[PDB]
Design a binder for this molecule. Structure first.
Ligand SMILES: O=C(O)CCC/C=C\C[C@@H]1[C@@H](/C=C/[C@@H](O)COc2cccc(Cl)c2)[C@H](O)C[C@@H]1O
Lengths: 224, 230, 57, 287, 342
C-alpha cells in the first residue's frame, strides 16, 4: 500500500462515517405511501394532519414522512415503507368496485407482501347522508348487501343510525375480506372511518404504526 | 481557488511564530494540506502534512518536535505553530492543497507563500541549468535512489514549475499525467528510477526552475531543480 | 378526430418497417457465431485469465 | 464419586453442538432480517451463543485436561498460572451469559412496549456498543481478583478454579463472592422484571405471534432462574456465613452443574425451540 | 368509415411483416450452433463486496477504464467505487432519494441519475472546488426516469415511464429529439457501440430500434408475454437481448428482424431484472428475482453457471469494457464483483 493509497483509504473511511451518520438520521422518521383515487380526498387528510409530493407531520415527537406520487412499476420503490395509506371514497357506490379492485392489486402485489395497509374509508358524513336519503341503494351495486346483517358483536358509535351502521360495516367488510383472503399474517389491514373534518387521522396512523412495528419485531424474535 | 499565507516576518532565534493559510473558493475540508518551504536561493523542502479530517499528521525530520501543523475546517484556516526557530528555518513557506483518490491530482494548487526570516529517497537533478531558445525542444532529467514504481502500477513522480517571482505550479503528476490547465506540449516519460520531462516548442512563459518530487513515501523529497534560461 | 389522426401515423410507421431488407436467419446466425469465435480468446469471463493477470485477486 | 470425566465431556459436547447449530441458523437469519430492520435481537443473540460456544470449549477443554492429569495440580501447575486462567474463564463464561440475557430482556422489552422509540431512536451502533460493553464488563470482573493481588483458588473437587470459599478470613476474600453473587442475582432480577413486563404487555395487546413469544419468555424466565439460583444463592451463603454455613462440596458441585445447563439450553430456549426453526430443521433432517 | 378502413390496413401490414420474417426464417440459431462445443461450467467467485449503501441498490454502471463504477441506491446516495481497492471515491447526496437509474459518462468526467422525480441530473466529477456538483437537471419527461446513457459529454439518451425516450443536449438543457411509439412505460435502453442506434424495452412487451440522428423507429420486436425490464446490445451491434417478467430472455436480430433464441428454464418462474453480455458475446448474464444471476450460453441457450451471492433481488449487473469482471447490484444493499479462475 503506497502513501497515496493510504490517504485514499482514509478518505474512504471518512465517506463511510458520513454514510452511517446519514443512515441513522433517515431511520428517525417513518415513511408512508399515500394512495387513492381522484375522489378519495387523500389530499384533505394530509392537509389537516399537516413528480413526488411530500408532507412531514409529527405525532408525539415522532416524525412521519408521507409520499404522494402524482403503477406496477414504480410501486417497487416503496418496498420498505412502514405503511401504505390507502384512501377510498365510501360515499360513491358506483366507484366502490374500482376501489376494491385497486385495493386488491396493492394488497396482492408481489413487492408489497410485508407492507401493512392503513385503510382510510374517507367521507363518512356523505355516506351517512346518502343512506338516510334512500335515493340510492347499495343493493343495486352489491347484490349481497340485501342479505347482510350487522354482527351482534359489533360496537356502533353512540347516536348512530342502524342503517348507517349496517352500510359502514358492509363496506368495511368488503375491503377486509380481500385483506384476509391472502397474506397469512405477513401484513395486516387497519381500516378506519374518516370524514372531511376528522382531526384524529394522524394519531390513528401513529397508533397503527406501533402495531406494524411491533408485528415486525415479533417476526424477528420468532422467525429465527 | 485561493491560498493566502500570513504570519511570516523577522523573528529572533529560538523564538516562536504562527503561520496561517486561509483557503477560499474550494472545499477546504476535503483536501489534505502540506507546508513546503524554500530557502533563499535554494530548492523546495517539504515540512509537514495534515490529512483531510486531521486524522493523519506527518513532519519532516528537520522540524519534527518543533513544528505543529493544524487546521480549522469551519474557518478554512491552516496553521503552522513553530517553536525554537533556527537560522536554518529562514525560508518562504508555501501552503499546498492535495486531495487523494483514484485519479486525483495532489499538489495541484500552491499558495503565494509567506516569508519567514530568522536572525529518505534522494531525488537527483544533475543538470542545474540548461540554456534554451524559444521554439526548441527541451528535456529535463530526474533520478531517484529508489524505484518510484509501486506494485499497484503507479509511479509516484511529480513535476513542478516555479516561474521567477511565482509559486510552483504542477505540470505532471504520477510521472505521466498532465495537470489541468497545463499546455499539451509538456510530456512526462519515465521508467523505474530515471525520468524525463520533455518540453516541445518552448515558449517565454516556460522559463523557470523545474522540480521533480517523489510521493512514494514520507518524507516527500524534492530534486535540486533545473533552471531554464534564454 | 384524435383516433383517425393516430391511425394514419400507425399505418405510416408500419409501412417503413415492412420495407426493410431482411437477411436469412441462417446468415444472421452465422455472423453471431463467427463474432463469438473470433473474439473468444480475449474474453476473460469465458476463459479465466491466470491469477497474475487478474486485477481482482 | 459424584465427579467424573464424562460429566464434563457430555456437557461440553451438548453445549458445543447446541451453540454451533444456533450459530449457523443465526447467521442465515440475520442476513434476511438486517434488511427489514437493524435486527438488534439477532445481534445480541449471536453474541450470547458465540460466548457460550467459547465458554463450553475453553472451560471444557481445561476441565478434561485436569481430569486426564489425575487432578495433579501440584505437578502440572507449579507456577499457579493455569488456575488463574481457569478462574478467569469460568467467571467470564458464567457472568457474561447472565448479563447478556439481562440486556436482551431489556432490549426486547423496549422493542415491545415502545416499538417506535426502539425502531427510530435506537441504532445499530448502540446495540454493538451495548454488546461489547457487556463482554468487556464481564472480563473486568473476571480480571478483578488478579488486579486486586488475589488469585483464584482450587475448589474442593479440585477440578475447577473459582474464588476462595474454604476458610475465608479477609474481608476482600468475601467481597468477591458477594460481588459475583450480587451481579448474578441482579441480572436474574432484571431479566425476570423485563421478561414479565414484555409477557404481560403482549397478553393485553393480543386480547399472531403473541402466544409464540409469550411461551418463549416463560421458557427464558424458568430456565435462567432454575439453573442459576442454586449456585448464586450458595455463593451468597458462603460469602456471608463463611465456613460456618452448611455449604458442602456436594451441594456446591451440584449447583455448578445446574448453572452449566443454562448455557447449554440458551441456544434452545432463545433460538432452537422455535416453530419456524423446528420446521427448517425438519426439512434439513429429511434431506 | 375512414377510421375502420385504416385499421384494417394495419392488420394487413402486420401480416405482411410477419410473412416477411417467416420467409427469411430458413433455419434456427439452435440448429446452426448445434455442432459447436458448449462453454462448459462457468464458475465465478466473489472477488469484492462493496459495502456502504444502506438501502436497495437500483442501478450500477461501470466506467470505461474497467476500474471505476457508479451505483445508485434509494438511500439518496450516488457512490463511485474503486473496484480494485473497494475504496469509495465519491459519495453524491441526491436531492431526490427515489433514484432508479445511473450512468457513467464514457469520458469519466460526468455521472447521471434520476428516478420518480422525472429529472435526469448531471453531476460534474472534475471541478476545481474538489466536490461533485450538479451541472444540469434535464426536465421534460412526464414520467419517472427508468434508464439513461451518455453518448458523449454533451449528449445523453433517457427513457421514461411516460412511454417516450428523449435525446438531450446537456449544454442547452433541451431535448433535441423525442422518440415516441411505445404504448407502455419504457423500462430500459441500450446503446449500440457506434452510438448511432439504440434499442428500448417497454411494458408493452415490445422492443423498438431507434435511429439517433433521424429520430424515428426503424424496427419493432415482439415475442415477450410480459413487461420488458432489461435490454442489452450484442457486442457487434447486430443483435440484442431482452429480459422480461415472463422468466425468459430472447435474442433478437436487427438484420433478420426477428427473435433467434429464447433463454428460459422450467425451474425459473421469476422475473428478470438485468441482462448483459460477455466481451465476446458468448455469455449472456441475467439477473433474476430469485436472488440469483444465471449465466447463459448465448449461442446454445444453455445455463452455463449461477452467481449466487445475494440475499435479495438482483436489481442490476454490468460487465467491464475489458471483459475482466462482472458486477452485480442487489436489493440487499451490496455490490459484488465476479470473475473466474484458471
Ligand atoms: O468436574 C466437575 O464436575 C465440575 C468442574 C467443571 C469445570 C468446568 C465445567 C465445564 C462447562 C462450562 C460451562 C460454562 O458456561 C461455565 O459455567 C459456569 C458454571 C458455574 C459457575 C460459573 Cl462462574 C460458570 C462446560 O459446559 C463443560 C465443563 O464441565
Amino acid at each position: 500500500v503506497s502513501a497515496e493509497d493510504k490517504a485514499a483509504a482514509e478518505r474512504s473511511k471518512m465517506i463511510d462515517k458520513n454514510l452511517r451518520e446519514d443512515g441513522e438520521k433517515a431511520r428517525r422518521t417513518l415513511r408512508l405511501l399515500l394512495l387513492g383515487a381522484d375522489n378519495s380526498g387523500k389530499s384533505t387528510i394530509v392537509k389537516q394532519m399537516r413528480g413526488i409530493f411530500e408532507t412531514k407531520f409529527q405525532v408525539d415527537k415522532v416524525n412521519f414522512h408521507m409520499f404522494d406520487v402524482g403503477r406496477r412499476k414504480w410501486i417497487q420503490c416503496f418496498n420498505d415503507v412502514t405503511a401504505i395509506i390507502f384512501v377510498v371514497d365510501s360515499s360513491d357506490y358506483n366507484r366502490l368496485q374500482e376501489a376494491l379492485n385497486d385495493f386488491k392489486s396493492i394488497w396482492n402485489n408481489r413487492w408489497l407482501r410485508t407492507i401493512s395497509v392503513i385503510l382510510f374509508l374517507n367521507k363518512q358524513d356523505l355516506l351517512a347522508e346518502k343512506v338516510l336519503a334512500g335515493k340510492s341503494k347499495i343493493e343495486d351495486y352489491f347484490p349481497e348487501f340485501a342479505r347482510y346483517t350487522t354482527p351482534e358483536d359489533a360496537t356502533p358509535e353512540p347516536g348512530e343510525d342502524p342503517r348507517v351502521t349496517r352500510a359502514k360495516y358492509f363496506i368495511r367488510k368488503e375491503f377486509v375480506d380481500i385483506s384476509t383472503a391472502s397474506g397469512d399474517g405477513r401484513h395486516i389491514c387497519y381500516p378506519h372511518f374518516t370524514c372531511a373534518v376528522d382531526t384524529e387521522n394522524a394519531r390513528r396512523i401513529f397508533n397503527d404504526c406501533k402495531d406494524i412495528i411491533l408485528q415486525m419485531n415479533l417476526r424477528e424474535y420468532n422467525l429465527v | 481557488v485561493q491560498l493566502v499565507e500570513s504570519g511570516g516576518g523577522l523573528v529572533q532565534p529560538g523564538g516562536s511564530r504562527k503561520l496561517s493559510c486561509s483557503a477560499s473558493g474550494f472545499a477546504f475540508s476535503s483536501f489534505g494540506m502540506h507546508w513546503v518551504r524554500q530557502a533563499p536561493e535554494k530548492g523546495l523542502e517539504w515540512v509537514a502534512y495534515i490529512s483531510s479530517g486531521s486524522g493523519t499528521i506527518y513532519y519532516a525530520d528537520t522540524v519534527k518536535g518543533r513544528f505543529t501543523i493544524s487546521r480549522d475546517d469551519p474557518k478554512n484556516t491552516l496553521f503552522l505553530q513553530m517553536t525554537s526557530l533556527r537560522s536554518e528555518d529562514t525560508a518562504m513557506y508555501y501552503c499546498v492543497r492535495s486531495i487523494y483518490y483514484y485519479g486525483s491530482s495532489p499538489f495541484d494548487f500552491w499558495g503565494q507563500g509567506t516569508t519567514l526570516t530568522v536572525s529518505d529517497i534522494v531525488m537527483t537533478q544533475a543538470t542545474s541549468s540548461v540554456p534554451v531558445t524559444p521554439g526548441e525542444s527541451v528535456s529535463i532529467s530526474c533520478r531517484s535512489s529508489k524505484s518510484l514504481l509501486h506494485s499497484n502500477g503507479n509511479t509516484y513522480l511529480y513535476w513542478f514549475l516555479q516561474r521567477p517571482g511565482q509559486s510552483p505550479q504542477l505540470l505532471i503528476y504520477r510521472m505521466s499525467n498532465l495537470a489541468s490547465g497545463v499546455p499539451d506540449r509538456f510530456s512526462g516519460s519515465g521508467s523505474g528510477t530515471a525520468f524525463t520531462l520533455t518540453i516541445s516548442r518552448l515558449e517565454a512563459e516556460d522559463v523557470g526552475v523545474y522540480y521533480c518530487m517523489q510521493h512514494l513515501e514520507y518524507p516527500l523529497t524534492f530534486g535540486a531543480g533545473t533552471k531554464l534560461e534564454l | 378526430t384524435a383516433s383517425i389522426a393516430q391511425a394514419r401515423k400507425l399505418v405510416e410507421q408500419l409501412k417503413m418497417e415492412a420495407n426493410i431488407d431482411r437477411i436469412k436467419v441462417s446468415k444472421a446466425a452465422a455472423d453471431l457465431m463467427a463474432y463469438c469465435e473470433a473474439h473468444a480468446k480475449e474474453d476473460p469471463l469465458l476463459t479465466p485469465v491466470p491469477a497474475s493477470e487478474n486485477p481482482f485477486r | 464419586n459424584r465427579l467424573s470425566v464424562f460429566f464434563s465431556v457430555i456437557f461440553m459436547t451438548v453445549g458445543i453442538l447446541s451453540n454451533s447449530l444456533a450459530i449457523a441458523i443465526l447467521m442465515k437469519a440475520y442476513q434476511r432480517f438486517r434488511q427489514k430492520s437493524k435486527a438488534s435481537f439477532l445481534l445480541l443473540a449471536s453474541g450470547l451463543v458465540i460466548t457460550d460456544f467459547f465458554g463450553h470449549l475453553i472451560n471444557g477443554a481445561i476441565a478434561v485436561f485436569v481430569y486426564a492429569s489425575d487432578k495433579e495440580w501440584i505437578r502440572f501447575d507449579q507456577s499457579n498460572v493455569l488456575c488463574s486462567i481457569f478462574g478467569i474463564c469460568m467467571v467470564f463464561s458464567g457472568l457474561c451469559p447472565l448479563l447478556l440475557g439481562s440486556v436482551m430482556a431489556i432490549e426486547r422489552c423496549i422493542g415491545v412496549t415502545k416499538p417506535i422509540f426502539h425502531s427510530t431512536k435506537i441504532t445499530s451502533k448502540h446495540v454493538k456498543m451495548m454488546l461489547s460493553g457487556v463482554c468487556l464488563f464481564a472480563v473486568f470482573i473476571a480480571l478483578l481478583p488478579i488486579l486486586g493481588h488475589r488469585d483464584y483458588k482450587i475448589q474442593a473437587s479440585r477440578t475447577w478454579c473459582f474464588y476462595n470459599t474454604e476458610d475465608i478470613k479477609d474481608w476482600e476474600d468475601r467481597f468477591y463472592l458477594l460481588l459475583f453473587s450480587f451481579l448474578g442475582l441482579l441480572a436474574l432480577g432484571v431479566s425476570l422484571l423485563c421478561n414479565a413486563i414484555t409477557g404481560i404487555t403482549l397478553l393485553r395487546v393480543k386480547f399472531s405471534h403473541h402466544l409464540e413469544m409469550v411461551i418463549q419468555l416463560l421458557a427464558i424466565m424458568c430456565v435462567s432462574c432454575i439453573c442459576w439460583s442454586p449456585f448464586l444463592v450458595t455463593m451468597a451463603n458462603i460469602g456471608i456465613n463463611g465456613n460456618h454455613s452448611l455449604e458442602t462440596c456436594e451441594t456446591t458441585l451440584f449447583a455448578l452443574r445446574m448453572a452449566t445447563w443454562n448455557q447449554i439450553l440458551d441456544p434452545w430456549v432463545y433460538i432452537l425451540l422455535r416453530k419456524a426453526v423446528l420446521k427448517n430443521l425438519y426439512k434439513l433432517a429429511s434431506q | 368509415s375512414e377510421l375502420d378502413q385504416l385499421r384494417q390496413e394495419a392488420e394487413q401490414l402486420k401480416n405482411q411483416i410477419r410473412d416477411a420474417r417467416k420467409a427469411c426464417a430458413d433455419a434456427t440459431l439452435s440448429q446452426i450452433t448445434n455442432n459447436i462445443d458448449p462453454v462448459g461450467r462457468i464458475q465465478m467467485r466473489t472477488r469484492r463486496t462493496l459495502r456502504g449503501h444502506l438501502a436497495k441498490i437500483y442501478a450500477m454502471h461501470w466506467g470505461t477504464d474497467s476500474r471505476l463504477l457508479v451505483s445508485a441506491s434509494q438511500d439518496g446516495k450516488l457512490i463511485i467505487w474503486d473496484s480494485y481497492t473497494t475504496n469509495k471515491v465519491h459519495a453524491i447526496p441526491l436531492r431526490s432519494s427515489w433514484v432508479m437509474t445511473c450512468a457513467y459518462a464514457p469520458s469519466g468526467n460526468y455521472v447521471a441519475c434520476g428516478g420518480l422525480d422525472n429529472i435526469c441530473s448531471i453531476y460534474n466529477l472534475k471541478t476545481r472546488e474538489g466536490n461533485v456538483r450538479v451541472s444540469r437537471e434535464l426536465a421534460g419527461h412526464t414520467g419517472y426516469l427508468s434508464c439513461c446513457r451518455f453518448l458523449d459529454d454533451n449528449q445523453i439518451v433517457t427513457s421514461s415511464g411516460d412511454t417516450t425516450c428523449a435525446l438531450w443536449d446537456i449544454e442547452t438543457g433541451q431535448q433535441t429529439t423525442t422518440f415516441t411509439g411505445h404504448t407502455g412505460d419504457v423500462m430500459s435502453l441500450s446503446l449500440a457501440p457506434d452510438t448511432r442506434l439504440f434499442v428500448s424495452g417497454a411494458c408493452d412487451a415490445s422492443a423498438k430500434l431507434w435511429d439517433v440522428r433521424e429520430g424515428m423507429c426503424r424496427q419493432t420486436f415482439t415475442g415477450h408475454e410480459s413487461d420488458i425490464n432489461a435490454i442489452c446490445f450484442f457486442p457487434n451491434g447486430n443483435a440484442f437481448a431482452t429480459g422480461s417478467d415472463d422468466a425468459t430472455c430472447r435474442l433478437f436480430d436487427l438484420r433478420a428482424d426477428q427473435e433467434l433464441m429464447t433463454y428460459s428454464h422450467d425451474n425459473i418462474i421469476c422475473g428478470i431484472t438485468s441482462v448483459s453480455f460477455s466481451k465476446s458475446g458468448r455469455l449472456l448474464l441475467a439477473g433474476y428475482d430469485d436472488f440469483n444471476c444465471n449465466v447463459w450460453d448465448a449461442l446454445k441457450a444453455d445455463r452455463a453457471g449461477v452467481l449466487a451471492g445475494h440475499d435479495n433481488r438482483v436489481s442490476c449487473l454490468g460487465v467491464t469494457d475489458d471483459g475482466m469482471a462482472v458486477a452485480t447490484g442487489s436489493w440487499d444493499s451490496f455490490l459484488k464483483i465476479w470473475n473466474g479462475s484458471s
